[PDB]
Structures are given as structure tokens and as C-alpha cells.
Amino acid sequence: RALRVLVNMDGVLADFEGGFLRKFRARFPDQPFIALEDRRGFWVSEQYGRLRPGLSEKAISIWESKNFFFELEPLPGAVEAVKEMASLQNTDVFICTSPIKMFKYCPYEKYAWVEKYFGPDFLEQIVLTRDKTVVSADLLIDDRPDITGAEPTPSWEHVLFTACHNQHLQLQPPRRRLHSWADDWKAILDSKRP
Amino acid sequence: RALRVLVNMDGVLADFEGGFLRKFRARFPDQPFIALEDRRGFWVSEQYGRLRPGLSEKAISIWESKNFFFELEPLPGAVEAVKEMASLQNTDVFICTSPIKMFKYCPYEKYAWVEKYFGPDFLEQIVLTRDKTVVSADLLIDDRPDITGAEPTPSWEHVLFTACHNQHLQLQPPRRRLHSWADDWKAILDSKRP
Numbered sequence: 001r002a003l004r005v006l007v008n009m010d011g012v013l014a015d016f017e018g019g020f021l022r023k024f025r026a027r028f029p030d031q032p033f034i035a036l037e038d039r040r041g042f043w044v045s046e047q048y049g050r051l052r053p054g055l056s057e058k059a060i061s062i063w064e065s066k067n068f069f070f071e072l073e074p075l076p077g078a079v080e081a082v083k084e085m086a087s088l089q090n091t092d093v094f095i096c097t098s099p100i101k102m103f104k105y106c107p108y109e110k111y112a113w114v115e116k117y118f119g120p121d122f123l124e125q126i127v128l129t130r131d132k133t134v135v136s137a138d139l140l141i142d143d144r145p146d147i148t149g150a151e152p153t154p155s156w157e158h159v160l161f162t163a164c165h166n167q168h169l170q171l172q173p174p175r176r177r178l179h180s181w182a183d184d185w186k187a188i189l190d191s192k193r194p
Numbered sequence: 195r196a197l198r199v200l201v202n203m204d205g206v207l208a209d210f211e212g213g214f215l216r217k218f219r220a221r222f223p224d225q226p227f228i229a230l231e232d233r234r235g236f237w238v239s240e241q242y243g244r245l246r247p248g249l250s251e252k253a254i255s256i257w258e259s260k261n262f263f264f265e266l267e268p269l270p271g272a273v274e275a276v277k278e279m280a281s282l283q284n285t286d287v288f289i290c291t292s293p294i295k296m297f298k299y300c301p302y303e304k305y306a307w308v309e310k311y312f313g314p315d316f317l318e319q320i321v322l323t324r325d326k327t328v329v330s331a332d333l334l335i336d337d338r339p340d341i342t343g344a345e346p347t348p349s350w351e352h353v354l355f356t357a358c359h360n361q362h363l364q365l366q367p368p369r370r371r372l373h374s375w376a377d378d379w380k381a382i383l384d385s386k387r388p
């Protein structure tokens with residue numbers, strides 16, 4: 001009976017794109033890179049591998065490194081918005097996030113990051129999964145255009161969170177965006193309430 | 195269109211009760227303990243705290259310790275059964291597990307344990323969450339009697355996996371058990387298929 005909202009972590013709460021670019025340039029100063037304006041498509045590794053041989057593996061090495069996830073900066077407005085959202089009557093918020101294959105640091109640091117920005121009690125709201133379609137809710141706010149998995153008819157409406165890699169994408173109606181946390185997220189939530 | 199089954203980790207795949215008792219007795223040999231036959235109720239910490247002052251905190255210290263989760267032994271038949279189950283046509287298996295509050299080791303070691311017993315490709319099937327009711331499926335096989343959360347009407351049927359702490363519990367019809375992995379799990383799955 002409470003509206004349930006899944007909020008994606010990387011590219012929505014945490015600035016994966018910015019953190020990755022900064023750390024890639026610092027580690028690999030002699031390699032070419034993709035400026036954020038020129039990012040296209042969800043997969044960083046795939047765009048970097050097209051740029052040249054061996055860059056896909058070098059990109060992956062950034063996010064496999066210790067401290068990568070933990071040191072991501074929150075996207076503007078994200079912490080404030082999600083705190084407000086969670087505090088709303090008849091509204092339950094979960095943070096829904098996919099870990100990488102290499103599991104040494106990523107799960108741990110994601111829990112640490114949520115504690116850092118939202119406090120210990122918000123840890124109970126984390127769902128770590130590679131398949132978001134088996135998580136049920138009214139809304140999923142997520143920067144990845146193509147969200148698929150084991151469930152062919154997910155219960156949520158996917159609202160596309162704007163990111164550098166998707167900002168030029170024309171969606172099929174009635175697919176809808178949340179343009180940033182400065183955009184009117186309350187209106188989107190209210191549109192799904194009884 | 196594929197039957198989806200959530201399989202709980204602790205108390206179903208991994209022998210939490212046995213591992214905990216062994217490590218508690220080794221660390222705290224001068225303290226009283228609860229033999230598995232005498233376990234009642236999901237919460238170990240709560241039964242130990244009733245046994246005496248300070249034992250709840252000493253129990254918690256076992257599973258907060260490094261290597262606790264990783265070193266759990268699989269329950270008899272569990273690895274074999276889940277491998278077979280996953281390989282069945284029109285059947286998708288996810289491992290659905292709740293982490294502790296202290297996140298330094300538990301998420302990491304749970305991923306490590308799944309890799310160890312099921313292989314790298316099975317990592318994609320893990321769902322870490324404190325709330326199982328927001329995970330949608332046809333079945334949930336889980337040793338905890340009371341499974342509640344944000345979703346008042348979960349999409350799964352909860353089948354109670356027998357454990358020392360629940361073996362004496364009379365369930366309200368039509369609630370049903372899977373008595374061990376030697377019991378006929380295929381019959382339970384088939385009962386939910388079209």
C-alpha cells in the first residue's frame with residue numbers, strides 16, 4: 001500500500017562516469033579517453049575498446065581497483081532528494097545496485113558508501129542484484145536504457161535517469177525521464193499513487 | 195514464463211547453525227551454549243541472551259568475525275540440488291540472502307562462497323537484500339518462519355526449509371516444508387508450473 005521506489009546507485013546516486021574519467025586519466029595519462037560529452041551507450045568498457053586495442057581492459061582495471069566505488073562523489077541533489085523521498089508518507093525507497101564480477105571491494109564499498117551518505121539505518125534499504133527485473137516496485141529510477149532479465153514483465157515503470165551516455169537517446173513512448181535530481185521527482189512519484 | 199525459485203543461503207545452502215556452534219564453543223569454551231536439538235526460534239542471538247547476560251553480544255561476535263561466512267560448510271545435498279535445479283528447463287534459480295549489519299566481510303565472503311561451490315557464472319544469480327518480499331518469484335525456499343517486509347503480498351509461495359530452530363513448529367495450512375535437500379524438491383517446483 002506504500003508506493004515503492006527503486007533508486008539505482010551508479011549513474012543516479014553516485015557519479016560513476018566522473019569518477020571513472022578522473023581516475024582513468026590519472027592512471028593512464030598517455031592514453032586517449034572519452035570526454036563525458038562524447039560518451040554514448042551504457043558500457044564504458046565497450047566504447048573505450050572501440051577507441052583502441054587494450055583500452056577495454058584498462059578501463060575495467062579502474063573500477064576493479066580498491067577505493068573506486070567508495071570514493072565516488074554523489075551526483076548533485078541525489079542525497080538530499082533520496083533522504084526526502086524516503087521520509088515521505090506511504091513511500092518506501094530501496095537502493096537497487098548491480099555489482100561488478102570481481103567482488104573483492106565492490107559490495108563492501110557500496111555498503112560503506114550508503115552508510116557514509118545516508119546513515120546506518122539506510123543499509124536495510126540496499127538490494128544488490130545483477131537482475132533488476134526480479135525486484136518488484138512501482139518505479140525504478142535508473143540511467144541504463146535497456147533493463148532486462150529473468151522477468152519479462154517487471155512490475156515497475158522504468159524512468160530513465162539522464163546521464164552523459166543516454167542524454168541524446170530518443171525513447172519509445174510512453175517511456176519517461178527524470179532529468180536530474182533538480183527535476184520534479186515528486187511529480188513522477190505522485191503520478192503512480194492511488 | 196520460466197519458473198523462478200529463490201533459494202535462501204544461510205540455513206538452506208550454508209550451515210550457519212553448525213558453523214556458529216562450533217566457532218562459539220571454540221572461542222568461548224567456558225560459556226554455556228545451545229545444542230542444536232535445543233535451538234528454538236530464528237534468532238540465535240535472542241536465545242543466547244535468554245540463556246544469560248552478555249551472551250547475545252558474544253554470539254554476534256562470532257558471525258561478525260572474518261571468515262565466519264566464508265568457512266560455512268554446505269548443508270548435505272544443497273550444492274548438488276541447486277546445481278540440478280538451475281540446469282532444469284524453464285527454471286531460473288536465484289540465491290536470496292540477507293547480510294548482517296556489519297558489512298566488512300559478510301557480502302564479500304558470501305560472493306566468495308557462491309563462487310567456491312557453484313562457480314563464477316553463478317555469481318549473476320545472487321540477490322543480497324534485507325527484504326525478501328520485494329523480490330518476485332514463484333517460490334522462496336527459506337528456513338525462517340516469518341518472512342515480512344515492505345510488500346504485504348509477496349508473489350512467491352514460501353516453502354519452509356527444515357532447520358533445528360523450526361523443526362517443531364506447526365505451520366498454518368496451506369504452508370508447506372521442504373524437509374532437507376534429500377526431500378523431493380522437484381515435486382514442489384512442479385506443483386507451481388503451468
Ligand SMILES: Cc1cn([C@H]2C[C@H](O)[C@@H](COP(=O)(O)O)O2)c(=O)[nH]c1=O
Pocket residue numbers: 008009010011042043044045046063096097098099100106144
Ligand atoms: C559503465 C560500466 C559499468 N559496469 C558496472 C559498474 C557497476 O558495478 C555496475 C553498475 O550498474 P547499474 O548502475 O546498472 O547498477 O555496472 C561495468 O561492469 N562495465 C561498464 O562499462
Ligand SMILES: Cc1cn([C@H]2C[C@H](O)[C@@H](COP(=O)(O)O)O2)c(=O)[nH]c1=O
Pocket residue numbers: 202203204205236237238239240257290291292293294300338
Ligand atoms: C541466527 C541469526 C542470523 N543473523 C543473520 C546472519 C545472516 O546474515 C542473516 C541470514 O538470514 P537469512 O538466512 O534469512 O538470509 O541473518 C543475525 O543477524 N542474527 C542471528 O541471530
Ligand SMILES: [Mg+2]
Pocket residue numbers: 008009010011012142143144
Ligand atoms: Mg546505473
Ligand SMILES: [Mg+2]
Pocket residue numbers: 085086087088089090091092093
Ligand atoms: Mg517513507
Ligand SMILES: [Mg+2]
Pocket residue numbers: 202203204205206336337338
Ligand atoms: Mg536462512
Ligand SMILES: [Mg+2]
Pocket residue numbers: 279280281282283284285286287
Ligand atoms: Mg534453468
